[PDB]
Structures are given as structure tokens and as C-alpha cells.
Amino acid sequence: ATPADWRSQSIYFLLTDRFARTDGSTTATCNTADQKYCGGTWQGIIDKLDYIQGMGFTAIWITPVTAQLPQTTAYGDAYHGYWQQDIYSLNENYGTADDLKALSSALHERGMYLMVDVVANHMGYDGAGSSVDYSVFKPFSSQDYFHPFCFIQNYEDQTQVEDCWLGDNTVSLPDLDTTKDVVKNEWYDWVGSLVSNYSIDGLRIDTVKHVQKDFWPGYNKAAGVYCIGEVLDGDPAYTCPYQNVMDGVLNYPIYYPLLNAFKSTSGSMDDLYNMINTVKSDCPDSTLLGTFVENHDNPRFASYTNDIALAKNVAAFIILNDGIPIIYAGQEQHYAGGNDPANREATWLSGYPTDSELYKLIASANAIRNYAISKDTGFVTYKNWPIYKDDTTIAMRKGTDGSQIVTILSNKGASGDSYTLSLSGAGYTAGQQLTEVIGCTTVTVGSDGNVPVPMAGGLPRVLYPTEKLAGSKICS
Ligand SMILES: *[C@@H]1O[C@H](CO)[C@@H](O[C@@H]2O[C@H](CO)[C@@H](O[C@@H]3O[C@H](CO)[C@@H](O)[C@H](O)[C@@H]3O)[C@H](O)[C@H]2NC(C)=O)[C@H](O)[C@H]1NC(C)=O
């Protein structure tokens, strides 16, 4: 599927080993500290697609599928998929080729997309960089395919970042020489055939900043689908230019100020407001980036604060910001693990309840985004616009005049007082009735254009014109 097809999508990102077992157990042990395979599979995912689609997601991003190093190392097993060794075989832990094809098929029957995580930068090896036996890699079975062994020392030095190796002498990540034609041609053949064989709709590309820019356009073309790259840097001046070589990137620039604004009742709304505008104007296309506040490479949101209202606000923001929302499996069950491996909790241990507070919040927010898109062909390309901020509040507006969604977020938290916010800048017409679609109440725009928004319990508010909801299931 094309970048244009992807704008409307909403992604649930999961770790295949950690999301759902074939046997559907909600009690099977998964001790994150042990860093071992816990038994999640592609068949497991198929059987829980209703859980995901019930939150209003239209796509999933699963971790890499290639055969990995087989050892249990001092850092555990390759359960996460990022330590590949044989790119033409699949990771048997997750199932067979037929199972991966069954997963893509199942998503397609539901009108959903499959996005697969891929690594081009490196293989993985159990042991010291100096001791690597290159014959174990397929098809890159020779030192000649790789950059000389050195570990990255200075992440400020982009040459080193691209040319030296990730990992360490316990698990080393041999760095492919992506400047060689034989390497490029092999990867380009591979990714086109991977996409074809498994009917993959999009790719998430790992470790993009660690491969020279002039590798990516050919890879994105060979894939033939939308690619979103992991460029792990919060500076928009460093990260957004990667959109010149790849369709999208993960929105790490928004990540940092977004997390800071809501992780406590004293977070900075100014920083978030300003970053929204910075990304809007400076990135080739904000509407092709992926918004997130939780993933497998940072502490989860709830690891900073257990306040359920704060978690509701940040989830609402992710869904209603420019670009493609991305929620990480567990966020909807208010998982609170810190840094890797603590943030790779098994989703099944939650019991998958569909009545958790965040499941319902996420469902409500995806519901209105999906509906708005179905009625407003301009919504996905309309640039999200911050219209208001104060010490504890940010409001923003996205959508064509007459159909815009206006979102008011608060960092007051669960102890927030009940008051009326006099909201200016929403751009509705005097006297227009709006529905607050999270709590299903109504508000009417004043004759001066102002919207009186009832605030309470630190809760997010999401407004949309009532007449436009006619015939929908939203607040019915
Ligand atoms: C998707 O399925 C296709 C079709 O089976 C796979 O095609 C196979 O690709 C391999 C690997 O490139 C080809 O391997 C051989 O490599 C040697 C080079 O030493 C070459 O000289 C041989 O002629 C041959 O190409 C193989 O021919 C090809 N098999 C077929 C039946 O076309 C493809 O690899 C799969 N893609 C993925 C990512 O699984």
C-alpha cells in the first residue's frame, strides 16, 4: 500500500513473541528480566485480531520475521527479532511461512494492513566482534560483505554512526557495508520478494540513521510499499531530512516534548505546542510520520506516572495528531515497565480486557478519527494546528472547516478541578452544536465563536459537530 493509503491508518505495534501464544493462555509465564522466548506466535496474533480491531486500529506493526541467531546469550534469546542471521528463512519460534501468510490474509479480510519490521543495518552474533564466524550468515557469508569491526564510540559523529558496529562483545551486531553494490542489490532483491511473498502492506525500518542516506531510496522503491523509518533522534533538523530518502519516519521529535508535557502535572505545554509547529513547517510531510509516546526502546508512559487521566490525554494526542497513530501493545492496559527488557511485558498476562479505561479511551478516539476520515477527504492532509495553550492545557484543531475535530488536553491529572474553559480559536460557527465524543455530552458554540468546554477530572475532551455524526455509532 502507498504512502497515501497509509495516511488514514492507525497502528497497533506488538512484539510477536510477547503478544499472543498459539494456545491463547493468559497465564503462561513471561519473566521479562530473563529475556527469553515466551512463546508468542503469528497464529496467536490472528486469534486476537478482534481485540486489536475493537480499539479501532486499522493496521498492525509486528517485529522482524527473519531467522535469528539461535543461542541463548548472556543477554537472552533473539525474541525481539533484531539479531538476524539467515534472511531467507523465517524465525521458527513464531510459526511457518504458511502462518505468516495466514496472518496477512486474516488482516486483509478485516480491511486491515500488515506492517513488518525489517533490519538492513546488521546481523546479530553471539560473541566478540573479533571472533565472528561470518560463514553463519546467509547469504552474507563472508567478512567481505561487512564494515571492518569497530564499535561506535561517538554518536555525534555520523560517519562512525553509519560505518561502525552496534552491540558489544557479548552480542555483537556485524555491520553490513551498505555502500557496496553486492549488498545493496541483495537487500533490494530481498525486500521486494519479502513484500511479495507475504503480501506485506508497509514496512517499519529499523536503525535507519545507522545506514548511509543513499541506501534508502532504492530500498523504499524495491519494497514497493510505504516505509516508515526509525530515526532515533529528537532533533527535527536531524530526523526530518530522512523524509527526503524514505516515505516517513517515526515522530521522535514530538515524542520528547509530548512525554514531558503529560508525564507530570507540571509538564511544559509550551514545548509541545512549539514542536507541533516546528514539525509542521520543517518536515517534508508531517502527515506521513508516526506519532507515539510508548515503545519497546523507552520506559512506558505509566512508568513515569500512574495517573490514569494523564495516560488518557497522551493516548488521545497520539490518535489525533498529524500522521499515523502508533500505540504499543500494553499501553492500553496501562503497562508500566521501564527500559528494555522491562518494557517487553507479555500482553496476554493482562487477560486482554476490553473494558479497561485505556482500551475504551483508545476505542473512542480511533472511532472519531476513523469516522471523520470517512466524511472528510481533507482530514488526513489537513495540518494539525495548535489553537490554544495555558499552564495546564493544550488544544488543537484538525479537519476541514465545518468538519474539524477540536481536541482539548489537560495535564491537571485525576485530581483536576471542575471548571469551564473559554476556548478561543476553534473556528466553528456561532450557535453550532458539538458533541464531546469521549464522554458523550454536548456543547454549543457561543455567538462570539468561543466554545465553553466543561473541564473535569483532568479528562481529555474531543469535539466534533453533532449534525455530522448523524447515522454513526458514536455517542448513539
Ligand atoms: C520469496 O519466494 C521466492 C520464490 O520461491 C524466493 O525466490 C528465491 O530466491 C533465492 C534467493 O535469492 C534464489 O536463490 C538462488 O541463488 C543463487 C545465488 O547463489 C542463484 O544463482 C540461483 O539461481 C538462485 O537464484 C532462488 O532462485 C529463488 N527461488 C525461486 C523458486 O525463484 C524468494 O527468495 C522469497 N523471498 C523471501 C524474502 O523469502
Ligand SMILES: [Ca+2]
Ligand atoms: Ca551501518
